[model samples]
Target: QGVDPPPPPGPPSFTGTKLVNDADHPWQPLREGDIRGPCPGLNTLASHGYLPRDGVATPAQIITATQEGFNFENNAAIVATYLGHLLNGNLVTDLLSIGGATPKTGPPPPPPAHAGGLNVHGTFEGDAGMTRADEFFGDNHSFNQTLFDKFVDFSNRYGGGFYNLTVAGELRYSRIQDSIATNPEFQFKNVRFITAYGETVFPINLFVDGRVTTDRKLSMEDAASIFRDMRFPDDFHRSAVPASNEGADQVLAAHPWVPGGNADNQVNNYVEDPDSADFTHLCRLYEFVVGSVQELYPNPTGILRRNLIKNLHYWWTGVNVAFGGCDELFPYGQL
Candidate 1:
């Protein structure tokens, strides 16, 4: 609910440099099968061999695998940056200016493009993680099994529940051009639609069960407190290791249905459960992780909101790019 060390200082900017093809880098060639992270579901899919082992496969091959395993439709190729990535780009620009010279007078840079297409960006907020399924049930952190139970339940309800509909779609990026034409400040803002993806929420009526409502509100406050507590220790809200990542994992682990390590003895380990049919446990995990963060940091609600939804909503990055990897040169080893 409060501002942490102000987001790493910078002009909000977006960088489109391919992570895989950039020269003078250290990353290996990106394959089609490699899983992008900060995503628990995709990670589970990869760990279970639902995705290919080498991320360096051709684009067509990667597409094929995603379709075969998850019936995954390639919504938008990962050419544009995530809303968070866009924000991060802005932060870096600001950081450079702290001791650097101010610009005299020049036209502002253009928004980034994906395959020359306009990049869209947006945000989501609400009771995404506030459910019982996300907690680790036993000592083992049997994430796979617990996730299965939650997914099954969701399926039974015909896609309704904690995991039923996490929202995603157009937002600021969809509106920025109009905003810029009318607002001067927003002109240099370099806003764009974050070719973004994320979950939508079905509002919870805390007013239903009086006791549940009381607890929900109280829990919501506690969650919010944690987000406020995690401010940037320095000028930039940026931590050497992103605080959001740590917070995200903690929130997911808090749900009651998440059978901890104790539930692993069963074939259906929820954390990384291989069974796609029984998805209740996974849905709980997803909701808890997303919901908790929103409740915790309701303020820059946009920042936290964007992160949670994007992390869960799957996007297809092209065969040439991997989100976070060594800065290796393309087509060969690091130069």
Candidate 2:
């Protein structure tokens, strides 16, 4: 297996708001073997045939799908997609399941070196999810009615009955408080710290129709159609322009909380983790990426090792190079 993976994709030629024609990309119901996971955006994409209906995708396909389907900005989308792959995907075959683990991602990488699917917790998915529960409470992947109700309540209370940036900020902070009060296994360390906030803004930024430019309000009906049904509402078009958590800063700034977790099975005992990445130390995230990938592939050879080197180099170029803060590490070679 001497093949190096292909280069990362660049932005599409057309970057403007346009109708996401249903005729071209028809939405289909899931089959018995189909898998969906914590990310509703991916779920909607798969349902609409923007991604493979089975829910497994190569990082290249993911980049193409998110771009053509949602107009997700190329730079930001590449960073997000590759990070998920680096942390949770199968390197040897360049495969990743959007949901649960399956035989499709090739052989497991060995003990404590899990190639668990997107549903795998802590390393990729984490607690205080907007529509999902903490891993401690059970059933961390599926949509929870209770959490959705709270989402609606917050939208009504804050955003004039719509989920907007301000509402997102409030709900994001509120969810953490709820987890601190209730979930003993709640964590906001390392990867989860940034993702939790970014996930909150995803629905608001990417789920809206391209036609709605006057206001950024995502209605209850539209939100539910995507959150619960994993389908865009009738006549739904994607965002007007390339988008990434467009308003994530507002969400995080509304009510700031540093990264940490409840301590010693205790409630309301949140501790700030100095080691984790904050806005100022985002480059440190690259270190976490390196450690997690190395842990899973402590020793590699032949095809596995080559693919790992190629993918890790791709990831370093996409993420770490942008920061210019963390010096890049070469696990496989000097070149």
Best of the candidates, lDDT: 2
Candidate 2: 10-residue stretch with minimal lDDT = 317-326
User: Best TM-score goes to which candidate?
Assistant: 2
Residue 241's C-alpha lDDT in candidate 2?
83
lDDT, candidate 1, 218-315, per-residue tens: 12222122112211111111111111111222222232121211132332222422322112322332233233333333343243334323322322
Candidate 2's error at 331, in angstroms? 1.7
lDDT of each: 0.23, 0.82
How many Å off is the CA of 206 in candidate 2? 0.9
* TM-score of predicted structure 1: 0.21
Q: Residue by residue across 1-335, what tens digits does model 2's lDDT show?
A: 33356767998988877666478778899998888988888898899888899999889988988888888888677777877887788877788889888887778765566667788888778988888888788788899989999999999999999998889999999999999999877888787887777788877778878878877788998888888888878877778788886777788888978989988989888888898987778777888888888887788878777787778777777676445546777787743
Worst-scoring 10-residue span by lDDT in model 1: 187-196
Report residue 224 deviation for candidate 2 (angstroms).
0.8
